[PDB]
Design a protein around this ligand. Structure first.
Ligand SMILES: *[C@H]1O[C@H](CO)[C@@H](O)[C@H](O)[C@H]1F
Length: 445
């Protein structure tokens, strides 16, 4: 009973610029939308902000070194837009420089990087103009994406255009739970449209520059189950499915929005007026791979409330993380299968984010995060069953190399395999991290 992964399975770890970097007002960086957002009372637990965070801006050389010794060959990070374009058309050399020195270390250590272009930290000066609700913002992204592709490109093996368009649009302008924090469904869908286009934008700039590195977008997807066999619950699950999965996957591989969902939104879509000629075509560019982020399945029931979807999420209390998320690895194998079947039916699948947050305690310099550990392994068994069965999964990046700013949850939630002591900023690998190093060694378990 062993699980040996492919010979070329890419193993790595992922992080995000605002979530770890710190150095918010250093090197010319100007405020991002989350710096404004974290300041609104009640938006983020304990009022935590991305101020300092893990301070990766100063400890990066050690962190990359710490990765190598940990056994990792791939590292996915993101570039802080506010660090590159602190203002309308200016290009901050000091910022392009930080990532350069970072890349030096990546290569010096002998690792293969994956640069994520957009990971929710939009420049506040851009949100001032209307942010993602304005087509013009797509032009500002083109500017940003070109600079980074020209300044590099000859050193990037994998390009990750947008990380989870669903969060940045639905949660950022619709539910108000992420930054900038608007509660307007007409904006959320307009924003989802514009961010989805920025994926095409970067994919075009990619072909024109003739870069050789791979390119793909990242969607957070979730397997959905109906709460009961009642017709309304089944309909409820369908809606939730199109809401998170189909509304972003459909345009990516089919060049269209889910018809059923388009109807359910109706008025809020304003008749798809935000869609201009050539937009859908621009958006339908799968690229060389499809990045996926998964954590747990959702159990859905119907309600007749005042919410957009009118769906309720049954809160499974059985085996859950410190975040209250159910631990159902079966659903991961199930979601991966459904992703191949539709949409990627062939195209390489890369798991750009998978992990869990548990309560961590130090026992004489070591953290026995048996819980987190069991979570990675079990979910890896699902990826293994997908493979072996014909699954095109070519990689897996454990989410959070280090504990970091967990958005609205702040620092209270730790996804790291490496412990961060925020009073001293010192790093300390968790048992789960040691387990991963051994695992990648034998390339299995
Ligand atoms: C994947 O989800 C985790 C857990 O919420 C976030 O910290 C990452 O930014 C996201 F890409």
């Amino acid at each position: 009973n062993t699980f040996i992964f492919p010979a070329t399975f890419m193993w790595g770890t992922s992080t995000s610029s605002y979530q770890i970097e710190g150095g918010t007002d250093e090197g010319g960086r100007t405020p991002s939308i989350w710096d404004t957002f974290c300041q609104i009372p009640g938006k983020v637990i304990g009022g935590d902000c991305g101020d300092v965070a893990c301070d990766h801006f100063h400890h990066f050389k050690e962190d990359v070194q710490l990765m190598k010794q940990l056994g990792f060959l791939h590292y996915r990070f993101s570039v802080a837009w506010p660090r590159i374009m602190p203002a309308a058309g200016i290009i901050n050399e000091e910022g392009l420089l930080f990532y350069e020195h970072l890349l030096d270390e990546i290569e010096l250590a002998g690792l293969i990087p994956m640069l994520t272009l957009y990971h929710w930290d939009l420049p506040q000066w851009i949100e001032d103009e209307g942010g993602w609700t304005q087509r013009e913002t797509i032009q500002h992204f083109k500017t940003y994406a070109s600079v980074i592709m020209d300044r590099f490109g000859e050193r990037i093996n994998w390009w990750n255009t947008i990380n989870e368009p669903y969060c940045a649009s639905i949660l950022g302008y619709g539910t108000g739970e992420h930054a900038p924090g608007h509660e307007n469904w007409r904006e959320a869908f307009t924003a989802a449209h514009h961010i989805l286009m920025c994926h095409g934008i970067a994919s075009n700039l990619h072909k024109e520059k003739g870069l050789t590195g791979k390119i793909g977008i990242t969607l957070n997807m979730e397997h959905v189950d109906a709460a009961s066999e009642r017709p309304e619950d089944v309909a409820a699950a369908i809606r939730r499915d199109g809401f998170i999965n189909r509304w972003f996957a459909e345009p990516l591989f089919n060049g269209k929005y889910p018809e059923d969902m388009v109807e359910w939104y109706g008025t809020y879509l304003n008749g798809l007026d935000f869609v201009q000629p050539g937009d859908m075509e621009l958006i339908q560019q799968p690229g060389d791979f499809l990045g996926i982020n998964y954590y747990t399945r959702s159990i859905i029931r119907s309600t007749n409330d005042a919410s957009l979807l009118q769906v309720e999420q049954v809160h499974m209390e059985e085996p859950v993380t410190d975040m209250g998320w159910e631990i159902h690895p079966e659903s991961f194998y199930k979601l991966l299968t459904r992703i191949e079947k539709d949409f990627s039916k062939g195209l390489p699948i890369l798991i750009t984010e998978n992990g869990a947050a548990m309560r961590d305690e130090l026992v004489n310099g070591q953290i026995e995060d048996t819980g987190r550990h069991g979570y990675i392994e079990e979910h890896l068994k699902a990826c293994h069953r997908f493979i072996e069965e014909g699954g095109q999964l070519k990689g897996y990046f454990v989410w959070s190399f280090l504990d970091n700013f967990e958005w609205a949850w702040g620092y209270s939630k730790r996804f790291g395999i490496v412990h961060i002591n925020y009073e001293t900023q010192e790093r300390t690998p968790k048992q789960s991290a040691l387990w991963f190093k051994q695992m990648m060694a034998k390339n299995g378990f």
